[PDB]
Amino acid sequence: GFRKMAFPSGKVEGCMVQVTCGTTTLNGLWLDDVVYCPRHVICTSEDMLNPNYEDLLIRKSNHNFLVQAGNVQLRVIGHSMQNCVLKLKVDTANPKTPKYKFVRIQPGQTFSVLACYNGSPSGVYQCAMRPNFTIKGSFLNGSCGSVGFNIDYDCVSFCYMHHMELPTGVHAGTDLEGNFYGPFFDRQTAQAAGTDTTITVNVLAWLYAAVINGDRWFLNRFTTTLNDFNLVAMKYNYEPLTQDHVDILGPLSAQTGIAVLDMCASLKELLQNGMNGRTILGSALLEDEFTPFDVVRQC
Amino acid sequence: FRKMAFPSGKVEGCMVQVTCGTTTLNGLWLDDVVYCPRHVICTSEDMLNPNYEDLLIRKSNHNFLVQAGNVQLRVIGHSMQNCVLKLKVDTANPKTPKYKFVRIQPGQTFSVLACYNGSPSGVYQCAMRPNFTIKGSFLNGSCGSVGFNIDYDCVSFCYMHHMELPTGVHAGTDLEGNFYGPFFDRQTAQAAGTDTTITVNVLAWLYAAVINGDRWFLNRFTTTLNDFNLVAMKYNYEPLTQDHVDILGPLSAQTGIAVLDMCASLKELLQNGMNGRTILGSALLEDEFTPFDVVRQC
Ligand SMILES: *[C@@](O)(CO)[C@H](C[C@@H]1CCNC1=O)NC(=O)[C@H](CC(C)C)NC(=O)c1cc2c(OC)cccc2[nH]1
Ligand SMILES: *[C@@](O)(CO)[C@H](C[C@@H]1CCNC1=O)NC(=O)[C@H](CC(C)C)NC(=O)c1cc2c(OC)cccc2[nH]1
């Protein structure tokens, strides 16, 4: 079996709180004695239309912020702003703070999302940072401040804080230093994303996952050069495949005994011939949201 | 719409490892009892055709190694209930959530927390197929991993993992140790019955499409439940039960499309095909989203 698998979310759930300023409420992330949340919590609905954030934040006091961890109210004893993230200092340390790091992920990398509402975790699922710096998430009203993360030997690497749903239904957010992924900004305005492309290295990793799980129907006897593959890939709005990608796919090629460029010839055939109503690992579409690491970790 | 698992933290705090001899798997620690698959008592040779009652005779409390991480929990009693072992331990788990044990029906979904050596590794949604298998993702050492739903902070445990079939799907028990489907906990190649499509979930999917403005497939016809069930079975679809009709109630009321009107719409999709059209951006009808899943994502 091969499934989209998220990291266990317990270490993050114990950090989710509710942050309220006036009539505006969203989720916050509580690590040690700091609560991180989207800065537009300070805005009224009219402010979000065209906010001058530094001007609005100087007009706020500590007592303007209501932070709730479960039923407990944590007193704000300080506040600062880092790009699009608000940092609320509280008088209580979160006893459940995990070992953690803040990281900015690269396009094509995956992370688990813990969707939260009113400070309470609701569901967990896997997302990839798209090449156009959106993510195809599942987020409703009140999900802002939900975070994305990876977990490596008990250490949580936070990489995403949720801010926005674009008109097309995809999602946009920041790293935990408050810098958006993509050309987006935190204003109540309709924003279009750049043209998205398909994460080629992930499609290849996923075809390897299919072979590891006993499916080989898409393979062929042909091969290709790296450049000839990249010409066809770009024609189909796939990202270029680099030699670093070829190397990263090494273990999966070694595990299956299928040279990377042999697998590229397979994908090239799938792109030019379609799948003709057949299916790969249950999907009628070429899946690009598993990294080579996601495949290795699960297989 | 996407497969969304429940947050797993309340279950992570219950996972332990259980070793007997050199055989290690996962267990579930609730209050002062640890639940785990009974084949932990088997030697690899014993798994081929085990007599569990005779095997358990030769076992005492002191043969069982229960560890939360590396911390041993002393076993003070043991008993077998169907295919699960219940180990009484001397410590009540302080992380025990409000919980119950439930036996689910085919078509219901649940989250699986995949674990190895008592350590949670990942979480994903599964659906119980009509042939009582799940399309899981399980490696060696995963037995004892559990499936669950969370409703208002109460965790309903429904699945404990035991087996991978030759076809690569998975089989297990409820938390009273009764297998889902015609399977046995022995080292033998077992086949499941032919599977079918989960009709009630396809209907839930069509409701989700209507909710989102995608309703070209709505027809001008209706059907009786009996007539629909007879036609569905000729397309390898599950027949609907009265319980299925009632769990579609909220979606029916929300859209104003009667359940039997949606059945007639599905009946036309089965007999005439989609004619190269899509529903929620897909040529295939999805059968792994329950009416509850649709409500929770919409
Ligand atoms: C937050 O929870 C805000 O606290 C909210 C999350 C989205 C709501 C629906 N789905 C979500 O993921 N985010 C927003 O509401 C943001 C707020 C900004 C950053 C100040 N705004 C949008 O996502 C937004 C605004 C508009 C829009 O206007 C006009 C027009 C079209 C799309 C759109 N998205
Ligand atoms: C547990 O980890 C075991 O404690 C393991 C989990 C599977 C291993 C690979 N993926 C899994 O989900 N379970 C087993 O190995 C069980 C043990 C039984 C219940 C005693 N056995 C099988 O899953 C099994 C045995 C055989 C078989 O024999 C011969 C032939 C074909 C398939 C098969 N599966």
Q: Chain B residues with CB inside 8 Å of A138's CB?
A: 1-2, 4, 297
C-alpha B108: how far from its chain's center? 7
Closest atom, ligand 1, to C-alpha of A25: 4
Distance from C-alpha of B45 to C-alpha of B113, rounded to nearest angstrom: 29
Q: Chain B residues with CB inside 8 Å of A213's CB?
A: 168
Measure A165 CA to ligand 1 centroid, in angstroms: 5
Q: Are residues B100 and B49 in the same domain?
A: yes
Cβ <8 Å between B4 and A214: no
Tell me which of A41, A70, A90 is where a domain ends.
A90
Q: Are residues B104 and B225 in the same domain?
A: no
Contact B64, B76 (CB under 8 A): no
Establish if B193 belongs to a structural domain. Answer: no
The 10 Å CB-count burial string (b at 16+, else e) for B150-174 is beeeebbbbbbbbbbbeebbbbbbb
Opening angle at CA A152, ends A147 and A158, nearest 5: 20
Backbone angles phi, psi at A41, to 5 degrees: -60, -25
Contact A249, A205 (CB under 8 A): yes
C-alpha A281: how far from its chain's center? 23
Backbone angles phi, psi at B53, to 5 degrees: -65, -45
Establish if A74 belongs to a structural domain. Answer: yes
Closest CA to B29 of B119, B120, B94, B121: B94
Q: Is B226 left (phi over 0), alpha (psi -120 to 50) or beta?
A: alpha
| Locus of tokens 């029916």 | B252
For ligand 1, pick from A165, A170, A180 the residue to mutate: most ligand atoms within 8 Å of CB.
A165
Tell me which of A65, A90, A115 is where a domain ends.
A90
Calculate the CA dihedral of residues B222, B224, B226, B232 and round it to 10 degrees: 10
Cα Rg of chain B (Å, integer) = 22
Resolution of the structure in the document, Å: 1.7
**Which ligand is nearest to the Cα of residue B20, counting in written order?**
2
Contact B118, B27 (CB under 8 A): yes
Q: Chain A residues with CB inside 8 Å of B123's CB?
A: 5-9, 124
Tell me which of A26, A59, A90 is where a domain ends.
A90
Distance from C-alpha of A86 to C-alpha of A60, rounded to nearest angstrom: 12
Contact A261, A245 (CB under 8 A): no
Establish if B192 belongs to a structural domain. Answer: no
Establish if B230 belongs to a structural domain. Answer: yes
Distance from C-alpha of B104 to C-alpha of B172, rounded to nearest angstrom: 12
Q: Which of A1, A115, A214 sits opposite B136 (nearest CB)?
A: A1
Closest CA to A163 of A150, A154, A172: A172
Q: Are residues B23 and B132 in the same domain?
A: yes
Q: Are residues B157 and B248 in the same domain?
A: no
Other C-beta atoms closer than 10 Å to the C-beta of B236 total 12
Q: Which of A3, A114, A122 sits opposite B137 (nearest CB)?
A: A3
Distance from C-alpha of B273 to C-alpha of A110, rounded to nearest angstrom: 36
Q: Which of A1, A7, A123 sits opposite B137 (nearest CB)?
A: A1
Tokens of B286: 């999805």
Q: Are residues B146 and B206 in the same domain?
A: no
Contact B223, B271 (CB under 8 A): no
Q: Are residues B168 and B231 in the same domain?
A: no
Closest CA to A90 of A9, A139, A32: A32
Distance from C-alpha of A74 to C-alpha of A76, rounded to nearest angstrom: 6
B113 and chain A in contact, CB less than 8 A: yes
**Nearest chain A CA: its distance from B54 CA (Å):** 34
Q: Are residues B64 and B148 in the same domain?
A: yes
User: What's the 3-state SS for chain A?
Assistant: CCCCCECCCHHHHCCEEEEEECCEEEEEEEECCEEEEEHHHHCCCCHHHCCCHHHHHHCCCHHHEEEEECCEEECEEEEEEECCEEEEEECCCCCCCCEEEECCCCCCCEEEEEEEECCEEEEEEEEECCCCCCECCCCCCCCCCCEEEEEECCEEEEEEEEEEECCCCCEEEECCCCCECCCCCCCCCCCCCCCCCECHHHHHHHHHHHHHCCCCCCCCCCCCCHHHHHHHHHHCCECCCCHHHHHHCHHHHHHHCCCHHHHHHHHHHHHHHCCCCCCECCECCCCCCCCHHHHHHHC
Cβ <8 Å between B123 and A4: no
Establish if A136 belongs to a structural domain. Answer: no
Kindly tell me the burial class for residue A22, based on how many C-beta atoms sit within 10 Å of its own C-beta (0-12, 13-18, 19 or more). middle
What is the number of structural domains in chain B? 2
Establish if A77 belongs to a structural domain. Answer: yes
Tokens of B238: 């599950």
Distance from C-alpha of A2 to C-alpha of A11, rounded to nearest angstrom: 24
**Parallel, antiparallel, or unpaired: how do β-strands A110-117 and A99-102 relate?**
unpaired
Distance from C-alpha of B263 to C-alpha of B229, rounded to nearest angstrom: 9
List active site positions of B.
39, 143
> DSSP readout, chain B?
----BPP-HHHHTTEEEEEETTEEEEEEEETTEEEEEGGGG--TTGGGS--HHHHHHT--GGGEEEEETTEEEPEEEEEEETTEEEEEESS--TTPPSEEE--PPTT-EEEEEEEETTEEEEEEEEE--TTS-B-----TT-TT-EEEEEETTEEEEEEEEEEE-TTS-EEEE-TTSPBSSS--SSSS---PPPP-B-HHHHHHHHHHHHHTT--TT--S----HHHHHHHHHHTTBPPPPHHHHHHTHHHHHHHT--HHHHHHHHHHHHHH--SS--SSS-SS---S--HHHHHHH-
* CATH code, domain carrying B288: 1.10.1840.10
Tally of residues, chain A: 299
B71 and chain A in contact, CB less than 8 A: no
Tally of residues, chain B: 298
Please tell me the experimental approach by which this structure was elucidated: X-ray
Contact B184, B128 (CB under 8 A): no
Q: Chain A residues with CB inside 8 Å of B120's CB?
A: 8, 10
Distance from C-alpha of A285 to C-alpha of B252, rounded to nearest angstrom: 30
* CATH code, domain carrying A61: 2.40.10.10
Q: CB under 6 Å to ligand 2: residues?
A: B 25, 39, 47, 138-143, 162-164, 166, 170, 185-189
Tokens of A235: 């024609």
Establish if A81 belongs to a structural domain. Answer: yes
Q: Which residues pair with B119 in a beta bridge?
A: B116
Interface of B with A in 137-176 (CB under 8 A): 137-139, 168-170
Which structural domain, as residue segments, surrounds residue A80? 13-90
Establish if A113 belongs to a structural domain. Answer: no
Q: Which of A2, A10, A123 sits opposite B137 (nearest CB)?
A: A2
Distance from C-alpha of B19 to C-alpha of B214, rounded to nearest angstrom: 53
